[PDB]
Amino acid sequence: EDISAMKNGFIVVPFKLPDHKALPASLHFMFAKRHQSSNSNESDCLFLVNLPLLSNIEHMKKFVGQLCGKYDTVSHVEELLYNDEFGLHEVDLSALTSDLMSSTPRNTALLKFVDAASINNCWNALKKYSNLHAKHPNELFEWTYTTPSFTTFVNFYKPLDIDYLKEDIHTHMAIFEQREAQAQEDVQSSIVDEDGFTLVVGKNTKSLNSIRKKILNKIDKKAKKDFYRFQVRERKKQEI
Amino acid sequence: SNIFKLQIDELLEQVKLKQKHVLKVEKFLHKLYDILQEIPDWEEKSLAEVDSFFKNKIVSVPFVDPKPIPQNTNYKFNYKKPDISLIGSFALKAGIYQPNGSSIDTLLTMPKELFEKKDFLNFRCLHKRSVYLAYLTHHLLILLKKDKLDSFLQLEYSYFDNDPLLPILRISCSKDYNFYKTRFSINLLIGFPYKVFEPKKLLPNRNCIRILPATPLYNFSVLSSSTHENYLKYLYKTKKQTESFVEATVLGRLWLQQRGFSSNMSHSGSLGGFGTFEFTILMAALLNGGGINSNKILLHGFSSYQLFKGVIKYLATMDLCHDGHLQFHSNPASKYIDEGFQTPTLFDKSTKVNILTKMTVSSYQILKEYAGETLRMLNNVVQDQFSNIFLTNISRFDNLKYDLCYDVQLPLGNNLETSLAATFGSMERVKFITLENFLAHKITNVARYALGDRIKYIQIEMVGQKSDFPITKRKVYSNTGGNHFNFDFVRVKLIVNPSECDKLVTKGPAHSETMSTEAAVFKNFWGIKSSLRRFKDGSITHCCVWSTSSSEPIISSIVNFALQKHVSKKAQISNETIKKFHNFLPLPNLPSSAKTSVLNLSSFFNLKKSFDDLYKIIFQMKLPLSVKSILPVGSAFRYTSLCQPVPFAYSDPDFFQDVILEFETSPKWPDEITSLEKAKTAFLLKIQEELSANSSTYRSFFSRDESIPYNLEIVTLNILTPEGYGFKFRVLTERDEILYLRAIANARNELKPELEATFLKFTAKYLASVRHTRTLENISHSYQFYSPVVRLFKRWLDTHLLLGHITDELAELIAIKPFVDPAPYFIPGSLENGFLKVLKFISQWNWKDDPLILDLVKPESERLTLAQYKGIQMNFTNLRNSDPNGTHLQFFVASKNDPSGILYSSGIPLPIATRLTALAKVAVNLLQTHGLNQQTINLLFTPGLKDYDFVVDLRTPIGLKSSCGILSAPSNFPENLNDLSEKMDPTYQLVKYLNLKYKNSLILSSRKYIGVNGGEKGDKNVITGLIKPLFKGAHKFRVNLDCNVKPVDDENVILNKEAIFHEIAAFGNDMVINFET
Amino acid sequence: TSDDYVLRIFAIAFTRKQANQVKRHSYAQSSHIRAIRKVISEILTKEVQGSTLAQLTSKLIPEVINKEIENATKDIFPLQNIHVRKVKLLKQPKFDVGALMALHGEEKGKKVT
Ligand SMILES: Nc1ncnc2c1ncn2[C@@H]1O[C@H](COP(=O)(O)OP(=O)(O)OP(=O)(O)O)[C@@H](O)[C@H]1O
Ligand SMILES: [Mg+2]
């Protein structure tokens, strides 16, 4: 209870758990740290560890909302990056098999903010909220477990809207055909280097990348033992 | 052959008796012979005098029934010094070490002057022998007291080879001359001199008990008793000639013991009659001929393996009971005669003794089958069969060795009912000396005739039969018997015939103007149950019709009626063990479900007919690509679905049977994976809309599939047939396979194994699945009982919460092992027999070191050859080389379809794999301690549920048992297909998601089928978890923990069990009710 | 087949002239013929081995085998009238009444009195 920050620098952020009849003051504990990275999409972000089950951005909207009201700080979290509770998106099978249409830890995610003023506001608010559990455990915020996203996952057996599916297949097929068309023209367009080297492209080749991949993936028989004067002399040597 | 030869040597030395004990026993009975010589003689005595002589003595004469009465016993009795000798295996020095203990057979020859030429009539010789055994026992006793040896010797009477007519004295040692460590017991056999009685008078056809009917049993006992040293001398010669006689003999002895064969009589009921002596004599007979042309079948230069093979082959092929018999001369080349005596016969012209008189017809048929079965294993070259032939005991359990067992409790059991004792009469007494022999035949004949062709082999066993009695008593005492019948109850054991065990009508002789003898016996045998019926072909025959039931087989009804009508109207026949297993199969909610037999697959066929209607519709529609083929791969298409299909029963997990739809090869398929899947989905859209327009009576909808990891674009079309069946369609494209192989190649080296796992699941669903369903469907027809047992086996796994991690196809491959490879047992022919064999295999399966490889073929091509067979084991050694402990992979199941051997057995956590073996060991151990009964079966199918760390109870809002199609109900599909989920059970999906979230810390389990194992309403299911040992204790905080933990120190955290319960609670919503930690 | 049903298949194909062809004939070189024959034998062997006869007969009726042969051998040389000319049954295994009944999808008598 007295623990507010971990020595490695991860601040403990307890949450009050909901009340359920089957399960008659228990808490869940988060571990957070400021994130630094030159990458723009990863800039202005906050490490979060030990996320609750099915924690979306709409969840983060609520938690920051209570902190903003309680500590009168202006903080907006734009999106929650790298939120993979179940690891479905660990690998991108689309990107790996080809480049067209896809040019590209665990139990953690990156919480990006709208601006630096928002994240540093939240970090200061988070530090105070960490101190609360030691003094006043009652006023710890309450995590829901219920969202419009949550119920959709709950209803596993839902037939897909056929109208929605048809449109999705239509647009995806349309986009793929354009990219496939552009790639095939590029390879069979008489590519010439600046120093006048013309690339050799076989018929039916569709994408220049595959030529690169094909490259990456990939005298003794004509020699006579008895033809020269020295060869026959060598044979004469081994004969005796 | 060299491997076999070396393996034989290891067995002989292992069972070789320790020579020190030979000296220890030889030290004793050498002196015992001196004690016998001290025994003095008698004068002539009548029964009155000897009766007074033994009136006060502790010893009592073991007179054989019928005991001599003063009127017919006027012949006197006398004793004289015997000619002591040693016979049996010990004389030939061919014995082996037996933990239970062996016996030394010492023969005492009654001097010839004690007998008259007609002493073989009316038990006259037998009663003289019995008293001769008395003063031996009496005055042996006091000399043992004189020599102080009585402290550690226990003396008791016993029957030689369970022969009621040949009582003998047994000397045993309890805890210098103390030989208890030798585990030996000296048996004193009082034999007659050679050729006292004209052997021609003692032939099986002749009679020797006056009352005429023949007396084969009585004639054998006296004649064999007078021929002991002769056979020893005969066997001694052969041992000298051929060097491998003893090695062959010990192999035969070891083979016989594993099959539960002994030299004891079989007329009493116990399986036996063929022992080491009979095997040895047969080998000697074959060494001097044996063929129809009197040519030698065995040569003296043969090795142990060759001598054993010839004897086994001789029994397997040549018939010695019905058509043909073998004659040899102990004192002359052995020749096979074509004529048969209708009983097992190995005649000896020199001695006029039939060595197989103790061998019953019913037992002989089983012996021939076992010899034939081994001759196949012996000829096998692909697989080593040494362990199965010699190092596996099949006689431990009757249930495993026999398909069905019925115990018949006879009435008035301190003597049998007057009606029953009356049936014995004098006529059967002379034929059959004891009532037990008579009753054993009576049960066998009626049971054999009543069941007829429905069974292959029948055994009648008298449970609780004793063969040794105290010296103070004359005859063995049974607690139920009261000296009247030495058995508690009779048990009928059968080997059913699956093809025709469940025939509804028992055919009989055809009708004629004059009733034939066969027609007469058929009508008399069945009485009112008989009838004359006509069939569609127009034939008129006598047949009796029975009724099928889902709880018991037809054979139960037949034996119950057949025995009661003929044996006793008061008999109680009860086989409840089979009944419990039958009830454990879910009962489908179809018309006349209760009356349907468990071998009926009509429910599956009706599903297939609905598929064919949809099959025609799909082919005839016009699509951009022609439909190459539609392949059904669902569970119901191979007769393995746990609950039989039921129309409109969509709460069943297996309701939607998967189907593989393949189009003609094209070059227009997308080269990118997600485009390929969306291109596949585009084809399903046309199949949906064209089906919707042309055939409005069919309903359809789309659902997403995520079984293949990282391929999130799979969309499957579900078709709701009007008949009330569901089918799930998925498109297979030739480009799809190579796109995955492209994936493994292009992926980074550390990631390469993970993609291989994705490919492994893909081939399990799309490629290997078609091969699996094809072969299993074809094979299952030959193995009728495979479908019920695999369904019951899957039911057993679900109760213990194992199906969640064991893929259904792995369970089938384990469940088929007793069928394709029944050795050393027979193919299962009963639901009880099949299921227990599966458990027996799992209990003794050392999956760490032994691979499981199966030849999915019909009973004796596609059989695994030596090259393929060697290839697969090489794979196992390579895998175990990298995974010696088996943490990554536990079960190695391979076959022609799966040469890799890891396709169906990957991803199972180690605790689950050990739990599956742990439960199997417990299940077999429970059966050994407590015999198969109602309580034991319930304990098998009840889950302990206490080992798991925390247990969560769930209740569905509505009971799904009715909607699952299980008879303790919907009749049409809902108007809005969204209503389907309202009557579904998601907990299986719930556990799957939670496993993947808490993969590093928890192993959650649940019951896949709630309608079968969810109580009466089928609404209760339980989620059981297991915390790994690592995260159970406290750990230092690291970003790589990947676990939900709570701090205790600045750098110390512990698993937050309570918080996890919340996530399970909200993730279950209303369904969760209770927690138990 | 997978049912141990030994059978012999005969396939027949003919060359065809392209849409813009002007030559009277459409003969193929023996190298093309040997190449086409190898492809056909591979397809016939593959389908029979990976199928039961009941499955094999199910393939014969829609003539999906011929369309598969067309696409595979097409790049080698255009073809027409591709058909499975004949099918023979050389050997049969042990007769199985249970399997036969399943393919076709028992009965009490009537008392004669
Ligand atoms: N079926 C038989 N026919 C004729 N004689 C027999 C028969 N069975 C046993 N005997 C005689 O009884 C003697 C002892 O019989 P037993 O069956 O104990 O022999 P064994 O093979 O030495 O026994 P074990 O297996 O105990 O070592 C045999 O040597 C033979 O003389
Ligand atoms: Mg013996």
Tab-separated table of C-alpha atoms and ligand atoms in Angstrom, chain B residues 87-90 102-105 160-161 187 253 263 276, ligand 2:
chain	number	residue	atom	x	y	z
B	87	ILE	CA	8.672	-86.864	-12.881
B	88	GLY	CA	7.525	-83.587	-14.401
B	89	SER	CA	9.427	-80.623	-15.750
B	90	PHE	CA	11.987	-80.935	-12.954
B	102	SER	CA	6.507	-73.953	-9.160
B	103	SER	CA	5.885	-77.575	-8.183
B	104	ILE	CA	7.964	-80.759	-8.062
B	105	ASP	CA	6.063	-83.868	-9.160
B	160	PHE	CA	-3.867	-83.290	-9.628
B	161	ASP	CA	-4.543	-80.771	-12.412
B	187	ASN	CA	3.450	-82.974	-5.056
B	253	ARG	CA	5.585	-72.389	-21.290
B	263	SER	CA	-2.510	-78.084	-17.685
B	276	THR	CA	3.830	-77.470	-20.891
D	2	MG	MG	4.201	-79.973	-13.451
